[PDB]
Ligand binder design. Sequence first.
Ligand SMILES: COc1cc2c(cc1OC)[C@@H](C)C(=O)N(C)CC2
Length: 113
Amino acid sequence: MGKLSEQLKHCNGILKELLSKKHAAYAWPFYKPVDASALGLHDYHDIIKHPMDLSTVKRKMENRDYRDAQEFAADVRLMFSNCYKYNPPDHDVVAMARKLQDVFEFRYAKMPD
Ligand SMILES: COc1cc2c(cc1OC)[C@@H](C)C(=O)N(C)CC2
């Protein structure tokens, strides 16, 4: 239980919060991979080269894929960046991304040193 383990516990706590009922009203678009075909978004995978979502982050955390907090944060921010790249900035889904990213960034900032 070095610094990396302690920081990954903080990351796991954040992940649990992002998936919690407290944030469900704006977190739900990020729960599962974007289903482009189901949504009729036939340009999604031409625009987004590296899809990411909270179920994928959860699988990677469960599989001990993340070696440090920075690697975890990069996936969570990739998920938000994909949303900001693909969707017009006035769309409800972007408002929901902004709100969940505020939750993420303020708690990520409280990382134990
Ligand atoms: C609320 O409407 C939308 C939901 C979703 C998306 C887009 C939506 O509005 C167009 C896709 C493209 C997206 O970025 N995520 C993150 C998944 C779901």
